[PDB]
Design a protein around this nucleic acid. Sequence first.
DNA 1: GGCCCATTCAAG
DNA 2: CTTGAATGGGCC
Length: 55
Amino acid sequence: TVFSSTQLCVLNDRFQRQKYLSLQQMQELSNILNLSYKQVKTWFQNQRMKSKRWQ
DNA sequence: GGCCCATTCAAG
DNA sequence: CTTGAATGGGCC
């Protein structure tokens, strides 16, 4: 799978301002991006890991 | 259930 | 080789 440049945008923007998202927030964010909840939740998790790594 | 973590695996 | 989406197990 691969995400659009359009998607990585709102995703990264949201992530920068909010590192933990609720169920509803993830689900709506997924809806307006025509993505599944799973891949968005997964993305966020992976991003949290990425954020951790930088040391 | 979600999160954490190590690990996997399909393209650049 | 790196990248990052995706997996499974362990924990609350």
